[PDB]
Amino acid sequence: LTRRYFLYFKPLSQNCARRYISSKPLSVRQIKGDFLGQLITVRGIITRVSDVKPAVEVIAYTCDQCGYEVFQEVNSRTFTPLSECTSEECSQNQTKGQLFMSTRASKFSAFQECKIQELSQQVPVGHIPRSLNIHVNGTLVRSLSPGDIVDVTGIFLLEAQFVRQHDVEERVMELITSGDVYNRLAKSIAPEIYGNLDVKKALLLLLVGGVDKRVGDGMKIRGDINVCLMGDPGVAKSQLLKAICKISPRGVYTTGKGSSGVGLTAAVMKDPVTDEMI
Amino acid sequence: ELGTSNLNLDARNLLAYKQTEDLYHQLLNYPQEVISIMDQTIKDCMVSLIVDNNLDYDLDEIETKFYKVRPYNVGSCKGMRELNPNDIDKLINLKGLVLRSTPVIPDMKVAFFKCNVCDHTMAVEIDRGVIQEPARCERIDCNEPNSMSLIHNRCSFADKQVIKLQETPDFVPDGQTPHSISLCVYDELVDSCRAGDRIEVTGTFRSKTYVDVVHVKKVSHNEVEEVRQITDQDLAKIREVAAREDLYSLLARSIAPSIYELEDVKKGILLQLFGGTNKTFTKGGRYRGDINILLCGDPSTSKSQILQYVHKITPRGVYTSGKGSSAVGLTAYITRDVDTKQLVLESGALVLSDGGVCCIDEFDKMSDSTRSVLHEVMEQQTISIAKAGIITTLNARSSILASANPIGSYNPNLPVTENIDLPPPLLSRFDLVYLVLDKVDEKNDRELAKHLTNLYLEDKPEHISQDDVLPVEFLTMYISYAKEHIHPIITEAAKTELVRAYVGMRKTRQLESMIRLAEAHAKMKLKNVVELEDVQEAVRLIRSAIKRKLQEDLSREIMNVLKDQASDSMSFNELIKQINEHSQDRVESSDIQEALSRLQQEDKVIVLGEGVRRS
Amino acid sequence: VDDVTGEKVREAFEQFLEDFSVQSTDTGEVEKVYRAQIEFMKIYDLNTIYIDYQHLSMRENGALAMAISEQYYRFLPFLQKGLRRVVRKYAPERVFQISFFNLPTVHRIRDIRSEKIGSLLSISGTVTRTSEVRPELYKASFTCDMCRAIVDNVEQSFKYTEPTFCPNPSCENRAFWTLNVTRSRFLDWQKVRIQENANEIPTGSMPRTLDVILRGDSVERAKPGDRCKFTGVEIVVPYKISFLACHVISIGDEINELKEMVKDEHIYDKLVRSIAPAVFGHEAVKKGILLQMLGGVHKSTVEGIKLRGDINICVVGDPSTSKSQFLKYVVGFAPRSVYTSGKASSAAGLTAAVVRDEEGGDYTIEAGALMLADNGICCIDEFDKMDISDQVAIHEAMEQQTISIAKAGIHATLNARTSILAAANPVGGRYNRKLSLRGNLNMTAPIMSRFDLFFVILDDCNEKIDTELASHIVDLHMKRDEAIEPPFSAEQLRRYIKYARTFKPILTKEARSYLVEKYKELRKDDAQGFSRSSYRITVRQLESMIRLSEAIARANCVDEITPSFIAEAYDLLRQS
Amino acid sequence: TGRGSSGVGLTAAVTTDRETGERRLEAGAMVLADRGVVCIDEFDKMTDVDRVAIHEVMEQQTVTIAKAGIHTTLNARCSVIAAANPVFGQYDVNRDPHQNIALPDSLL
């Protein structure tokens, strides 16, 4: 009741783990069920976030007859109003006078729900990236802006405590030393089709991206390429598209009609579990 | 003596006083208790003032009268963003503008209960939002246990009203968007605050969160900040940079250093955001210094850049685009708010941007039904809605910045009034047009490519400061000082050069545009009196901003084959046939198709049928 | 506390209605006319009486009126029971309606607070929309759950009610009785929309509207699109604060200045240059605009049909002129003036479109510029870009003075008298002197007709008046210049317009004998014409100069018109 | 029959159960036969939802579903036998063979 501060935790890194486990990057498919109550560090994108709302922790009731203000503690999503007086003066009395609520002495918390999603290359073959719910409270309430990758460390009831955001040389030098690196990397991707080295060579330059330029005066230009494939039927088109989305990370296959109108923009929808406008 | 029970109290006086420093630090956390005990103490000190002097019967009404206190002199805050949960039930102040006033809802302070079988009445009152409903009778005539009934048409109510408020603090953090707070007024303060005014408001922050208003300030020896604060050294730098000769181009170079020259276009948007002079009469007249601009010509140049840059300069404006903004999105509309599940009304597209500029792209692809509202805001600057639920004329003080495209894909062989596919009149009512055509050649586009790769020469533009270019923060301060400190008058001395500037376009909308252009020329360079040289450049501006064989033969032939047809229709075929029939000037049947389309659409001639041609 | 006060106020109201008979012969002493009013309605049995509040304010030194005035809803059945007892004792299917009128204070819609809930109030404003008439429940026949017994239940005009106990002790339940409509009692109920007047709107505020309910025989009297004054009770609706009206009415040094302004001789010359001080030149357009504000007699007949006694004014010419400035002046000066842009209009929109309400999907009729501001100037900018439907609706509104609306089964026609200020432009914009007005205006002959005067404005390069026009334009561009200033303000011009409006002159025989020769002289120009002449001359131009004659008679404030003042109207018709 | 499926099509459907107080999955058809054959008559009366479903399970030879509380992929290599009728009712050699089919080119 007199808590001026807010207590939070953070786990140890892998560098302190090798130097004499508890904090492993966990998937939502790697939850198994039995980890309900362990501190877990989950990695993933954030698609759904909610607004900051004040959730009460303890309800303060005041009386004019006795003066002893009482405090009850809520734990669930809902509660009931304690209209009956449970003070230390009304027990030894015939009168059981009315009680009122105080929105000032009651302790609140900045509650916010969020939906963490499974990472694209961490999902198995054929499976879809299912979601999970994270319930945050306090000062961590503004550390989650949608459209990013995050590592969330918290207990699993998800009550987050701390958030953060973002042999190999032999593998790159043996790819370099063979000679004609550009043409080898061009003809290496998607070899189940015939020819078209130029189109897929520009697809190689498309997925490598380019350089984002900032003038440092409030103006940002694109450092990206956008490629059109206009063609007649008979030659394969979905295979090159599927190979580009399978090789490159975070590749999402779309369509023309269907739920595409709501599949390209935010779509308002009611949420039943918490009952709100998400 | 006049019956005003309200008392306006300044808390700053309680702050500077030697004895009450413990009272100002006690009312900021608990206002509900101190207002309730202040109502008793003000009545006690007033009756102490009554008993000190000889008086008539004034105690017969003040014994039951109630008096309250409205504290407003408190320091500023950062809106709703700084309102953390430790600031609940504390006093707070918000500065902004209100947008929507709901109808008055009643709140049941009391309630009647009647025993429907024996008819004894009981009045109950409110207590922290609960109304105890008595179960059975208790009198001596109706002792039996039976159900009561609630009556309300005989119970007094009090006024309540929820008001939408668009907040804007003195300082805003990076990434913050403007917020819409739902405030709620009570009795004796209803219909005093309504949409359209800059309102300072103060009250108690509650929790969904809201603010329970204790005072409003409809009006504004104090240090209350009105405009963006400047110092004396910055004012001296403004006066020293305003005395130079090249300032007229310096600003036009400093408004956008990432692009090219665009002297007429950049000079026009510079004086468009300078505004001009807005003068009115006492009761029935108003005039605003304003220019509505349009851009047309060759594509793929800095047009959208400008359309975004100005949205990043003005504090009020919307980026409306093409067919995605209809008439229900351009003024105001009703909405069923699912929040309170009530029919609220909300202003969009032209009343959200009341002040500043408004940017429209793809003017030619816009529909004809929504062109009628911009036909009124061209020079009338008003919105007159007459529909179901609303008959309201309102302010549309903003200026439009529209980017358009010509027909096809530019053609100098066709006139300017037919190439951009729109009405001449409405366009005659346009204050400023801009031919932003490229007309590609040598020793120009080479410098264009060189300037675009000169910032690609280095990885970071740290070397942007050693040139004649003012910074953005000095520019907006100079512009905000000049827009609110200079009211220039257009004297009679510039009469003679205006008449002759009008007759050159005549050999009233152009005259109304050029006087606002000349007063904006007077708005710059710190001038209070307009000068004779200032209109010269203005006219050069509108003369440089705007800088037949085909159709003739066409019609000619059409006439011919008509004549030779005994006036019957000319065929598509025969048309094409005689028209290529001459080797000289090569009328390609496609070009033919096009010009034909033009005349017909120009309504000069009529053609029908996909497979045939009609004269 | 009002259970014993209601019988006392019922006794006081019936003593007020019983102690006052009629002794009104020879305009002597006064006493109220209520008993003869009941004796007159005895034959017709409508029972929709009218009681003046000013006539009720004299008893108990006004204290009876002040006690009834705050507790009106709590004293209303006692008042109707006292009225029922006095008509049961003075006279031998029974509905009653008590209406109060003529309040000494007129309250606006912005001064309504919650302190007057249940009290009576006078609300003035303008009606925006009207709904259909509907049968209101009154009393219903409820049947029990087991008894199947009829109960005649009386509603209390609030919401669907329900009994509590069955009268027959065969049951004592409180479950849902079922409603029955055979032994039920229906009537007319209407819900209209009242809104804030244009002369009392605050600066920057919105004209807030509200819905007012109405019962009895006060329905089907309020015409849509007129200034109205209601008297009723403030009743809350689940909440919202609505109103219930019982009375309907169709409302809507000074003489030392007026008598000084009617005794001179140069008033009309300052009037033609003071009706539009912001426009340089164009005295003919100013003459037609000044004579188009006030008309003549419309009931000049012996058959029984009203005629078109109004002046239609239409302006044409090249663009970028000052002809829209008059359009911006009329609406800023005339109180009975509605302006429309033309392109943002339609047929239904101009007069009365229909919009749905979801409570029962029911329709309500929104008005418009058309059929508003009666005996005023309706000004339509851009008359040639309108459709065919609104222009034939304008022609149907000009062929007959009434307008008919047939929608959703209901047919309603209403009186309308407006003067059209039509601003038009050519098909090419530039006015060519090559041909007639018909091919350049591009509109058909019946909508081109019923127009009293056409104003054609052509411009060219004439430096001597052009330099003066440009100097006037640049001299106007300053803070409230004296150059624009008229010889006299609008302060006496508004009361002069009203004083000339209530004049009603009568033409003479010498004027008619000169008028027949003037019509022969005007029709003689049609012979060997095709020069200057541009249109046909028939009865309509004769009617236009006849209507301009009484307008110039009213402007010069003469009761009997001389042909010398009609000679200026003949010259005005010759100038066009 | 190609028209009349209670779910969203043949492959599956969502249901609510008060036993568990939750939502379960119902398997209407194509997910039952995993190696056999399925026959759809009146192919032109079949809506676009099942058309999008057979666009995905044709060469894919499987299916995938992500719904409120589940994400998964199923394997079902079946063979389809579709029978259709034209929209004109009759067809002859002189009419064009593309518009008489009343189906998109992707389904061809």
Swiss-Prot record, chain A:
Compartments, as annotated in UniProt: Cytoplasm; Nucleus
Domain of life the protein comes from: Eukaryota
Positions contributing to ATP 1 binding: Y194, G234, A236, K237, S238
Function: Acts as a component of the MCM2-7 complex (MCM complex) which is the putative replicative helicase essential for 'once per cell cycle' DNA replication initiation and elongation in eukaryotic cells. Core component of CDC45-MCM-GINS (CMG) helicase, the molecular machine that unwinds template DNA during replication, and around which the replisome is built.
Note: Present with 166 molecules/cell in log phase SD medium. Early fractionation of eukaryotic MCM proteins yielded a variety of dimeric, trimeric and tetrameric complexes with unclear biological significance. Specifically a MCM467 subcomplex is shown to have in vitro helicase activity which is inhibited by the MCM2 subunit. The MCM2-7 hexamer is the proposed physiological active complex.
Quaternary state and interactors: Component of the MCM2-7 complex. The complex forms a toroidal hexameric ring with the proposed subunit order MCM2-MCM6-MCM4-MCM7-MCM3-MCM5; loaded onto DNA, forms a head-head double hexamer. Interacts with CSM1 and MCM10.
Family according to the record: Belongs to the MCM family.
Protein name: DNA replication licensing factor MCM7
Species whose genome carries this gene: Saccharomyces cerevisiae (strain ATCC 204508 / S288c) (Baker's yeast)
UniProtKB/Swiss-Prot annotation, chain B:
Motif Arginine finger per record, residues: 428-431
Phenotype for K303A: Loss of MCM2-7 complex helicase activity
Entry's localization field: Nucleus
Gene Ontology CC entries for this record: CMG complex; cytoplasm; DNA replication preinitiation complex; MCM complex; MCM core complex; nuclear pre-replicative complex; nuclear replication fork; nucleoplasm
Domain of life: Eukaryota
Keywords: ATP-binding, Cell cycle, DNA replication, DNA-binding, Helicase, Hydrolase, Nucleotide-binding, Nucleus, Phosphoprotein
Residue spans crossing the bilayer: none
Binding residue positions for ATP: G297, D298, P299, S300, T301, S302, K303, S304
Domain MCM residue range list: 247-453
Reactions listed under catalytic activity: ATP + H2O = ADP + phosphate + H(+)
ATP-binding listed as a keyword: yes
Biological process, per Gene Ontology: DNA replication; DNA replication initiation; DNA strand elongation involved in DNA replication; double-strand break repair via break-induced replication; mitotic DNA replication initiation; nuclear DNA replication; pre-replicative complex assembly involved in nuclear cell cycle DNA replication; premeiotic DNA replication
GO molecular function, one term: ATP binding
Record's subunit section: Component of the MCM2-7 complex. The complex forms a toroidal hexameric ring with the proposed subunit order MCM2-MCM6-MCM4-MCM7-MCM3-MCM5; loaded onto DNA, forms a head-head double hexamer.
Protein name: DNA replication licensing factor MCM4
Gene behind this protein: MCM4
Residues shown, of full length: 235 to 926 of 933
UniProtKB/Swiss-Prot annotation, chain C:
Example of a GO biological process term: DNA replication initiation
Motif placement: Arginine finger: 449-452
Positions of the MCM domain: 267-474
Primary location group: nucleus
UniProt key word Secreted: no
Positions annotated to bind ATP: G317, D318, P319, S320, T321, S322, K323, S324
Modified residues (Phosphothreonine): T508
Catalysis: reaction(s): ATP + H2O = ADP + phosphate + H(+)
Any one GO CC term of the record: nuclear pre-replicative complex
Top enzyme category: hydrolase
E.C. code: 3.6.4.12
KW Hydrolase (keyword) present: yes
Keywords for this protein: ATP-binding, Cell cycle, DNA replication, DNA-binding, Helicase, Hydrolase, Nucleotide-binding, Nucleus, Phosphoprotein
An example molecular function term from Gene Ontology annotations: ATP hydrolysis activity
Phosphoserine sites (modified residues): S205
Cellular localisation: Nucleus
Its job: Acts as a component of the MCM2-7 complex (MCM complex) which is the putative replicative helicase essential for 'once per cell cycle' DNA replication initiation and elongation in eukaryotic cells. The active ATPase sites in the MCM2-7 ring are formed through the interaction surfaces of two neighboring subunits such that a critical structure of a conserved arginine finger motif is provided in trans relative to the ATP-binding site of the Walker A box of the adjacent subunit. The six ATPase active sites, however, are likely to contribute differentially to the complex helicase activity.
Misc. comment: Present with 13400 molecules/cell in log phase SD medium.
Family: Belongs to the MCM family.
Subunit structure as annotated in this protein's UniProt entry: Component of the MCM2-7 complex. The complex forms a toroidal hexameric ring with the proposed subunit order MCM2-MCM6-MCM4-MCM7-MCM3-MCM5; loaded onto DNA, forms a head-head double hexamer. Interacts with MCM10.
Included range, full protein: 103 to 834 of 1017
UniProtKB/Swiss-Prot annotation, chain D:
Subunit structure: Component of the MCM2-7 complex. The complex forms a toroidal hexameric ring with the proposed subunit order MCM2-MCM6-MCM4-MCM7-MCM3-MCM5; loaded onto DNA, forms a head-head double hexamer. Interacts with CSM1.
Family: Belongs to the MCM family.
Note: Present with 35100 molecules/cell in log phase SD medium.
Entry superkingdom: Eukaryota
Functional summary from the UniProt entry: Acts as a component of the MCM2-7 complex (MCM complex) which is the putative replicative helicase essential for 'once per cell cycle' DNA replication initiation and elongation in eukaryotic cells. The active ATPase sites in the MCM2-7 ring are formed through the interaction surfaces of two neighboring subunits such that a critical structure of a conserved arginine finger motif is provided in trans relative to the ATP-binding site of the Walker A box of the adjacent subunit. The six ATPase active sites, however, are likely to contribute differentially to the complex helicase activity.
Protein's cellular compartments: Nucleus
Protein name: DNA replication licensing factor MCM3
